[PDB]
DNA sequence: GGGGGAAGGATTC
DNA sequence: ATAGAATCCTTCCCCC
Ligand SMILES: Nc1nc2c(ncn2[C@H]2C[C@H](O)[C@@H](COP(=O)(O)NP(=O)(O)OP(=O)(O)O)O2)c(=O)[nH]1
Ligand SMILES: [Mg+2]
């Protein structure tokens with residue numbers, strides 16, 4: 161099997177430059193203004209010119225300005241970045257019927273019925289990397305290996321504007337030399353938990369016995385890293401059906417008074433039902449972030465569809481149930497819809 | 502013993 | 515100081 165991976169380079173900032181080529185070369189940093197005061201929020205992404213001085217996703221907009229107070233700070237236009245992303249995807253379907261859209265800047269191509277050697281897979285790559293540059297003027301980074309994981313890891317080192325093939329005996333090489341936090345699916349919570357058991361590379365998952373591994377990171381994670389250690393990561397490319405749609409907004413004031421959170425909640429449903437459009441959910445969840453950044457939610461499943469009048473009605477009792485069972489101020493309110501028809 | 506949901510956790514975008 | 519969005523997974527609990 162041969163898997164082809166596509167990670168658009170700093171996709172949000174790149175699109176802003178395609179629409180305003182003057183920015184090309186300057187530190188661009190796209191922001192998520194929360195609104196509670198001036199320059200409150202997070203950085204969604206920053207182009208590599210701004211990445212150098214440590215302007216990355218996650219750090220608040222304040223810190224991103226003590227570092228580069230003269231960079232170009234633009235508000236995120238996710239609706240514009242989506243329209244550009246779909247046009248790029250609709251050019252990738254021209255290379256395989258079996259394609260998986262992972263995220264907005266990510267896609268796997270199963271091209272085993274279109275090539276059969278990493279050399280022709282490599283030669284397919286640039287004809288991707290340039291058809292995209294030909295029609296949408298965006299650079300991408302492609303990775304190719306024997307499964308969806310190492311194709312991911314390939315692009316993880318090749319980016320930006322990169323191309324990389326990880327052959328089946330570098331796969332053997334990596335299992336023994338790859339820091340395991342750099343395995344896709346292992347964030348900081350579980351990376352630390354692995355060091356605590358002396359697991360630095362993927363091979364150490366077989367030297368240790370199983371239930372020591374399961375009880376700390378979980379059964380699916382354990383059976384996941386275990387299958388990659390023995391070079392037995394199956395896993396194909398299948399169309400991803402969007403199973404959830406929602407929106408969650410941040411209040412200008414921390415509060416728990418219900419008639420203060422009703423406006424933000426009702427505005428979260430108006431946008432969510434627009435994002436739905438012809439999709440009827442059977443379940444609504446009321447997500448809420450606390451004043452201490454914790455995450456609590458209450459939901460319900462209906463045997464039928466939910467019309468905006470029924471979502472307006474349900475979301476207030478789920479909201480009541482939250483405040484019923486916790487004493488903390490609410491910082492972010494939202495809603496989320498699943499179980500579509 | 503195990504199927505099958507509704508609420509916190511963790512990854513990544 | 516600490517966005518938004520969505521996926522999968524674990525854990526507790528009702529049910530054969
Ligand atoms: N709202 C929001 N959006 C984010 C966040 N993180 C990423 N995104 C959105 C905006 C990101 O541009 C888009 C893709 O994210 P990546 O693949 O993780 N990084 P990119 O491809 O951008 O650059 P490079 O690969 O060179 O780091 O996901 C975030 O924390 N918040
Ligand atoms: Mg990318």
Ligand SMILES: [Mg+2]
Pocket residue numbers: 167263265266514
């Ligand atoms: Mg990505």
